[PDB]
Design a protein around this nucleic acid. Structure first.
Ligand SMILES: [Mg+2]
Ligand SMILES: [Mg+2]
Ligand SMILES: [Mg+2]
Ligand SMILES: [Mg+2]
Ligand SMILES: [Mg+2]
Ligand SMILES: [Mg+2]
Ligand SMILES: [Mg+2]
Ligand SMILES: [Mg+2]
Ligand SMILES: [Mg+2]
Ligand SMILES: [Mg+2]
Ligand SMILES: [Mg+2]
Ligand SMILES: [Mg+2]
Ligand SMILES: [Mg+2]
Ligand SMILES: [Mg+2]
Ligand SMILES: [Mg+2]
Ligand SMILES: [Mg+2]
Ligand SMILES: [Mg+2]
Ligand SMILES: [Mg+2]
Ligand SMILES: [Mg+2]
Ligand SMILES: [Mg+2]
Ligand SMILES: [Mg+2]
Ligand SMILES: [Mg+2]
Ligand SMILES: [Mg+2]
Ligand SMILES: [Mg+2]
Ligand SMILES: [Mg+2]
Ligand SMILES: [Mg+2]
Ligand SMILES: [Mg+2]
Ligand SMILES: [Mg+2]
Ligand SMILES: [Mg+2]
Lengths: 62, 152, 119
RNA sequence: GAGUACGGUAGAGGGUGGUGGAAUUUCCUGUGUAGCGGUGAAAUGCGUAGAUAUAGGAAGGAACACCAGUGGCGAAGGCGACCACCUGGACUGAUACUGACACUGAGGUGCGAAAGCGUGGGGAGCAAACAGGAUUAGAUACCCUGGUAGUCCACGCCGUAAACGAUGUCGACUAGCCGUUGGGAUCGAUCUUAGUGGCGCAGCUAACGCGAUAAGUCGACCGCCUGGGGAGUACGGCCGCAAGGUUAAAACUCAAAUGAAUUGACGGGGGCCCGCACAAGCGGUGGAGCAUGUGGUUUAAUUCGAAGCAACGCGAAGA
């Protein structure tokens, strides 16, 4: 999440490249994750639900 | 409504000036189906404007409308605890009708002798932009710009 | 009465879900001008919008134009809105932006955050 | 069958020490000036005694981002930073060895999340109790601002959980298909082994569903159930420092309680669609006077009927 403006490109390419890098680094997701305490039961439930959906979607592709 | 089925109705019947805006204003000042009474009122007001000063009445009327039609409007939307008043750019068709309605409405409460004279006074005041209608217009603009954080 | 000159400064944007804070300093971390959303006249639900961040960034830039400051690097930090309106307002002030970085602090395990709200 | 000796693998299995990096909070200092913080909106609270923000330094405690996965290990509870030391089991291949040495298990013994208790340390973050601010008819709550025991460590006690796969342990058989974890072979493919997942034929089931990780077909042994309340309660016994745990009834009362599924209705559940339903407009009612119907009251009688929308200029198109 750090970009530079190089060789006089307009300040619309740089901003969008900065946004793309920030999205790739998962900054906002990390900040939203630690806003409150998620008790380990809820975390395990979320992981199980995510695994179920992932496997079902992967199976449905064929 | 939901159907979007009713198109517009066109009537263009100016009897002695040949202007559409004058006919629409005659529609606005009409009440209870008195077409001819409204025509007499409008013509009397324009004749008073013509007599008061060298200005011709049609141009005075048109540039009084151009000095009264608002640019942006306030529309309310609730969010569950507060209703925010977002601004929207008035459509090019809505501004004329809003201007006409405001003009006739504040003319009806001007307070002097007759409706023809009341309209005359309102047109003279609006051609210079000092009546109550322009106060309402600038109030609407300042309210709309004061809520510019929503805009979207 | 007293004045000073400086070029090639650093602008810190501190975004949050409630308010944004803009602070222009020199490279050594010494503040020159600062502006916020509550100080620009919004004060409420309007304080938490990218428009308020834009206004704050322009106000702070116009305040910092006294020293010169023809070059600025940018440090963004926070999850709130205005994370990008301030950055686009800063160049609109008339600056030249060398780079943009994100300095949001992420704990690795850290302390535990508060309870979850039951709304 | 069950075990032993020999190479080799995988692992948040356990215990004792040491060390990292990110971040929070407090303290000191420089820049700088009027807001910060919070909310559905606010307010309490923090700031011109100089806050928030930004930069440099220090202290201290706790939890280990990414890897991370229907992944792994453990009898279960459970175990995620890195390194050294001590240590248990599992998987895997060949040869040799002992020769039924096995399974289960009433009593009994031991391990057992969190909260809790005793003695002694520690104190960053969070947070029962508690205080203040809102909301509300009230609000001993949800929301906001703070905050103590506790959460952490050493030793000891407690012995309970929706301690769940709501499925006791051990052994033998019964079509297949697609993943994944730790190994072997044969020529990316085939075979095979111990785990971990999704489908599915038989068969089973009240149905839902299970289906080689059976709830199928069979053996060995143990625990437990006999309508709902009273009640896992009372009394006694044994444990505990205490909270309490464990074993465990009776009178009385009811004629049901219950599981799975079907049709409808409903939801401050979801997805589409419509209607003067909203939104954009015009004219009214509610205030005055009168007309008229109704309620109530009065009267010898004020004759019956119509009563949310779907009664009241209605039966009555004529007291
Ligand atoms: Mg909160
Ligand atoms: Mg500071
Ligand atoms: Mg610091
Ligand atoms: Mg035992
Ligand atoms: Mg404990
Ligand atoms: Mg305790
Ligand atoms: Mg106590
Ligand atoms: Mg205690
Ligand atoms: Mg103590
Ligand atoms: Mg607190
Ligand atoms: Mg204690
Ligand atoms: Mg039990
Ligand atoms: Mg049970
Ligand atoms: Mg069994
Ligand atoms: Mg078994
Ligand atoms: Mg079995
Ligand atoms: Mg078996
Ligand atoms: Mg199946
Ligand atoms: Mg059964
Ligand atoms: Mg009974
Ligand atoms: Mg008891
Ligand atoms: Mg007893
Ligand atoms: Mg005690
Ligand atoms: Mg049912
Ligand atoms: Mg429904
Ligand atoms: Mg309406
Ligand atoms: Mg009335
Ligand atoms: Mg009657
Ligand atoms: Mg009628």
């Amino acid at each position: 999440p750090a970009v530079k403006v190089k060789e006089n490109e307009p300040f619309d390419v740089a901003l969008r490249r900065f946004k793309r890098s920030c999205e790739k680094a998962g900054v906002l997701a990390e900040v939203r994750s630690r806003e409150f305490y998620e008790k380990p039961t809820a975390e395990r439930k979320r992981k199980a639900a995510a695994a179920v959906k992932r496997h079902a979607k992967k199976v449905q592709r064929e | 409504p939901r159907r979007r089925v009713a198109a517009k109705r066109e009537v263009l019947a100016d009897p002695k000036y040949g202007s559409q805006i004058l006919a629409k204003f005659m529609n606005h000042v009409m009440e209870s189906g008195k077409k001819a009474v409204a025509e007499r009122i409008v013509y009397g007001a324009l004749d008073k404007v013509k007599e008061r000063g060298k200005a011709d009445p049609l141009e005075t009327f048109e540039k009084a409308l151009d000095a009264i039609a608002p640019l942006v409007e306030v529309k309310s939307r609730r969010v569950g605890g507060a209703t925010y008043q977002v601004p929207v750019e008035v459509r090019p068709s809505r501004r004329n009708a809003l201007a006409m309605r405001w003009l006739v409405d504040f003319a009806r409460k001007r307070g002097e002798k007759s409706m023809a004279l009341r309209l005359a006074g309102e047109l003279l005041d609006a051609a210079e932009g000092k009546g109550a209608a322009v106060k309402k217009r600038e109030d609407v603009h300042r309210m709309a710009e004061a809520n510019k954080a929503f805009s979207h | 009465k007293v004045k000073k000159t400086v070029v090639d400064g650093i602008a810190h944007i501190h975004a949050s879900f409630n308010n944004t804070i803009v602070t222009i300093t020199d490279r050594q971390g010494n503040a020159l001008s600062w502006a916020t959303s509550g100080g620009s006249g919004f004060r409420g639900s309007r304080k938490s919008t990218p428009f308020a961040a834009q206004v704050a960034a322009e106000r702070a830039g116009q305040a910092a134009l006294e020293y010169g400051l023809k070059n600025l690097d940018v440090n963004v930090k926070g999850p709130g809105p205005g994370r990008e309106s301030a950055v686009r307002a800063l160049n609109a002030c008339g600056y030249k932006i060398a780079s943009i970085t994100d300095v949001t602090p992420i704990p690795h395990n850290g302390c535990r955050p508060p309870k979850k709200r039951r709304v």
